[PDB]
Nucleic acid binder design. Sequence first.
RNA 1: CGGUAAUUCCAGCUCCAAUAGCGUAUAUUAAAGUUGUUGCGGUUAAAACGUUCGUAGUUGAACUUGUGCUUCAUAC
RNA 2: GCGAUCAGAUACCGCCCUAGUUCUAACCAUAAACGAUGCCAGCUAGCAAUUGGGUGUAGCUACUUUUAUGGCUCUCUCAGUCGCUUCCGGGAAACCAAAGCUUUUUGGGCUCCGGGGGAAGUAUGGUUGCAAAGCUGAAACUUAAAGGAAUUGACGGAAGGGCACC
Lengths: 120, 218, 129, 227, 82, 107
Amino acid sequence: MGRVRTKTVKKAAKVIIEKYYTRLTLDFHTNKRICEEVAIIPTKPLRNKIAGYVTHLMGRLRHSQVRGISIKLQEEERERRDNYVPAVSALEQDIIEVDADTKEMLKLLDFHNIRGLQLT
Amino acid sequence: DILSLKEDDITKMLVATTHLGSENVNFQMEQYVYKRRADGVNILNLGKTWEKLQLAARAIVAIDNPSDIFVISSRPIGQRAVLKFAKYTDTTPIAGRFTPGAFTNQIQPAFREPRLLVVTDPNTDHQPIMEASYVNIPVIAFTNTDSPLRYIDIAIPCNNKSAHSIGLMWWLLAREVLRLRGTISRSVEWPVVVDLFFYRDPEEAEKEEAAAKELLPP
Amino acid sequence: VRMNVLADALKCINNAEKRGKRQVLLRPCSKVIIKFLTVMMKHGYIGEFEIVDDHRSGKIVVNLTGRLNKCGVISPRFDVPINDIEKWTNNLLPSRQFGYVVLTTSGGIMDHEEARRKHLGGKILGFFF
Amino acid sequence: EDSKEWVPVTKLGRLVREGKIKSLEEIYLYSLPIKEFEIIDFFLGSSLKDEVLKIMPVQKQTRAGQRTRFKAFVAIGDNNGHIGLGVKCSKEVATAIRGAIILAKLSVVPVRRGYWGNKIGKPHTVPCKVTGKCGSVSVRLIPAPRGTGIVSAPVPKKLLTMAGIEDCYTSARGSTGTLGNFAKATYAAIAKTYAYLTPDLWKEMPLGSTPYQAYSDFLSKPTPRLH
Amino acid sequence: MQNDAGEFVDLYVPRKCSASNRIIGAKDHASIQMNVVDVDPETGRQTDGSKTYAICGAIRRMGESDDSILRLAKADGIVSKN
Amino acid sequence: TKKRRNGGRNKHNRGHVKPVRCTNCARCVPKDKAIKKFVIRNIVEAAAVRDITEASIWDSYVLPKLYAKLHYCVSCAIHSKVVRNRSREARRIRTPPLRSFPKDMAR
RNA sequence: CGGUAAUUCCAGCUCCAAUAGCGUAUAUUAAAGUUGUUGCGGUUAAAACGUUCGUAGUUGAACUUGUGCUUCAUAC
RNA sequence: GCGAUCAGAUACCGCCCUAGUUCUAACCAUAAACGAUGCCAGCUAGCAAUUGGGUGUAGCUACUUUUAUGGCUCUCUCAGUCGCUUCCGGGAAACCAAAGCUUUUUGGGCUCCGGGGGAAGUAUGGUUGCAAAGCUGAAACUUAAAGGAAUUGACGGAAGGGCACC
């Protein structure tokens, strides 16, 4: 609320999980320690800055992810979010619904004399 | 012949509510629709628009590199069709935020100069065509009856409002670009299923898993 | 009121190609006007023009090829002798190269260079380019 | 010394640095959007010299108490058939005079030269009567025969000599002492010389080449090819 | 333009609109040279030899981009049976 | 220094038309160019509504409201924050907006 | 511009101008498309009688003998 | 005339009535009498309302009965008038569908009518009014600017939103 995450603690945060979400958890006091390995902070109060916020979003990472960040671990399942749902096709296989003024357009443009039933 | 309408596909256009047209006419948009029903149903000449798929098809081919054709949809109901549309043609799927202007780039040595343009929606994407209008771009599009037809060549009206309409219109174009020097082997049935440009369920997508596997424990 | 039946017919031709009207619905079929549209076709300025005749006045349809810039009219018919036709070139034309003012003398309706060979002084109706 | 070997932003300058475009008209058929000044210095630089028009000042009003800014009208142009105009604000003159002149290279127009009354020997002045109306400044161009130089105001003669005309009766109406629309309108006046249909141009064309398609092979390769 | 001794003297000849006969201005950056191509009449099989056209932006500003090429395709018989 | 396009209100093919005075200033102004708020305001101001239900002879009598079309002039609108001060462009709509709640002062 | 460190004043200095001519004032045309038909302006920058009829004014539709037909001088 | 208020109020606020608004008979005839834009002919773009009149319902609804006259809805239509859209027109701009087509040193007709301020809508006469006053209208003198829209300084007691015991 009263303390706002600044640009340095936010815009630098968008890659460090994106590069190293693997082998990183929500446990803060060890993720506090991990900042020295992947990064170099000048001062540990900025480690007290940048590590608390990224641990204040790991459940929000896990549940209801918000734009601006990419996980790269759920990115491959989006191709299986590109799933065929069997078996969607034509609804009643023709379909027989016709507006009875495009029914002549089914007859005059198309030579298809296939089944069309009018519903008012 | 085969370059004629192939009327079995028009049976799927009735599934895609392509006969329905929007009510404001925009007098430059007149020729493709035929009649208006009472209680607000405009009825379009569906035999016309299939040849306008062809005129769209006859223009998009005979361009050697398939990269510098850019497919556009800002509305998220159209983004579902177009990013999977680029799985077969080699276009760049740019759907949603177009970040104007695209005209002094930051990290890419290949400048964001489009060459050819396809767009789903003419109305909400009135800005990126205006982006492209500065730099001499043909803007092929789908459309509806109520549309500012400025700088649009060409415009394909079917329904342009429902996911069952818009996802299937990309399926027909993927035939004709592969029917015309794209080794589909002469207008035969797709190897793939022809409805993958679709919302499986509206967002947020309910947990229907991959390959339709059902839960054995509850 | 339709004051001059000549000039009003001319301007709607100029009020076609700006929004790109390739056709012109035009009124009211006077034989002085029929002596004028073929002069455009005598240098190929417009497309095909045709005239239906109702039994009041007749009316004209005009197709256009799109090569025109502006057709104009001096009003009314100023009397011009031979020795002073050259004054009406430079004030009305872009240059001596192209363009044609059109007057009519006692021999008929013609081009000015046609009149510069026919040599008979007459009255200006209009001009074009 | 360049001092920098020019990089192409877009593929258009990539095409001219590859040497596959050797014609300044090649962009001029389809009005190609030239948004790098290096292509102007690729084909030209020879006979492409510059002259400043004014260095006139402006002011920006602030909280306390003023803000002074500069503004310099300038015009580069090839000595036969081309000209460019432009201007740009700057908080210092040397930031303007070395930077504002870049803009006019994006405004290089082919100037069509014409005869007046006789079709012999390398047309000189102007095709037809063309006016440039821009902001109470209507420079009307009237073709002239030989001997008679470019008559104008005392100011725009340096534009028209570095464009390529020799003979023209020319004026305008209004406050030319408000110079800001005056040199700008001539830039729009002389540009319209290819916006007039001529019966000399009534035969058309082989209808097009589009060097995108004619040079897509170099476009398709992702290799940074030299030469 | 052309001299007495038959030469394209000036610099070049700028383009002209195929559809509605206008000029193509040197800075009019909304003019398109689009190149539509042919079909083998049996089934697909695009051949070479294509149909380029010139459309001016003044037509493209009014919104008559689309059906203007519908005139030329029927005038060239490419899109037929309409 | 013309800002409105048509000007005030509703002077199409008439000339000069009916006035009635404002209530809170009575600068006598024509009926078109004066701000015309219309309100069905309630009687108890939504606070004694729970008290009259106990003191009612019948089952709550259910309470009516008042109806009177009031008429305001321009400074009356601005000296009570009725309608004020859009942009040079945001003066170009009439029909929208409220968008949030069933409007109070009725209520 | 001159109100105490003067690029305009008074001198000297050099520089320039046109040159046997320079200057003054005064009317006149051009510049001035700021007396205008060509050649502007009238929403507001100076500006449509509040009004409608209404003669003198002034301007007025269309329609009122020809393309041809054959030949030659004649381009080719 | 009187009370306040104020330094003063001869005013902004109150109280009283007086000319008069009233309708009949006339008499001036001017207003920012404004859409600060004269009138008639033509073309050029939509979109949406709505007035009347037509017309088509291959419309419902009304019951006098399914009807009928009648209502609404849709369709078409002329006179439009409003509004909105974007020149792709035009302007110095706000704004404009005509203020556009007066661009190319341009032309659809006809009338008045302006040439910097202030002198000044004052004098001088005529003309008209029962009058208060109008159609009418200058000059020596004096002046280098008066204004046209727009940008910026006013989150300079002016609107809307948020801050410290300067």
